[PDB]
């Protein structure tokens, strides 16, 4: 999945008129997501991680 571009995205669109471009049919990497020590908080609700 090309989620890295969104991860390092320079700009984000508005909440009311964000451009709709569906991206699917892939398996994500989550390689860099394993290092969560740099994030101030980490919350999960409704299911244990």
């Amino acid at each position: 999945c090309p989620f890295g571009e969104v991860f390092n995205a320079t700009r984000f669109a508005s909440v009311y008129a964000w451009n709709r471009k569906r991206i699917s049919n892939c398996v994500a990497d989550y390689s860099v997501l394993y290092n969560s020590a740099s994030f101030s908080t980490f919350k999960c609700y409704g299911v244990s991680p």
Partner: antibody
Amino acid sequence: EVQLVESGGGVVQPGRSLRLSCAASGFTFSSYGMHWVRQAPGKGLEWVAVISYDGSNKYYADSVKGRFTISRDNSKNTLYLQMNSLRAEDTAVYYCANGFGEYYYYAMDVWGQGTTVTV
Amino acid sequence: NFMLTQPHSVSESPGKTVTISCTGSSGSIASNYVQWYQRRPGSAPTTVIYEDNQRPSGVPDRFSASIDSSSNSASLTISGLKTEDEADYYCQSYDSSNWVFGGGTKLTVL
């Protein structure tokens, strides 16, 4: 079934060169990482460092960066931690243990027994 | 940054049901092993409970450790209180690599 014993030398003069090992086996060590935790007396648990599997990005604490250098080899499933210029504040039991689950560190189940080190 | 919420003042008569409340965050309370640390002034600190499965001789059976997910809270009741054991309870938690001290808890037993 689950027996892990730590062994090493006794009285070691500070500044000497010696290598230690805490071999982890019996499972898939390829996907399992080795973590080291130091427990300061009176205070809570202290984070030390973390290493990514890819190795592109490595993060270290400000109090351990520069002086220490770690080396690991997935082929032999053994981690080597060369201790140079031992500090007085580092005189504590060293826990050789693997993190909870797969790629999880925020959770802790079993503490480290500790290794016999003298500073 | 981190916000700690505790009651301003609360007390209950002995012999009734008491429940000390300390909110847990920065993760799942069912995934955190809550281990209490005490440092009695005038004495040298020594570990009393570690590894969550080792019992030194003389450890009382009254203390029990578990997590209750029915009401998202933990219940602990301590009997056999001793006069020299009267002190202040402080609940401490750590997130990443930051340490935050509490505002100060004062409790008086009437």
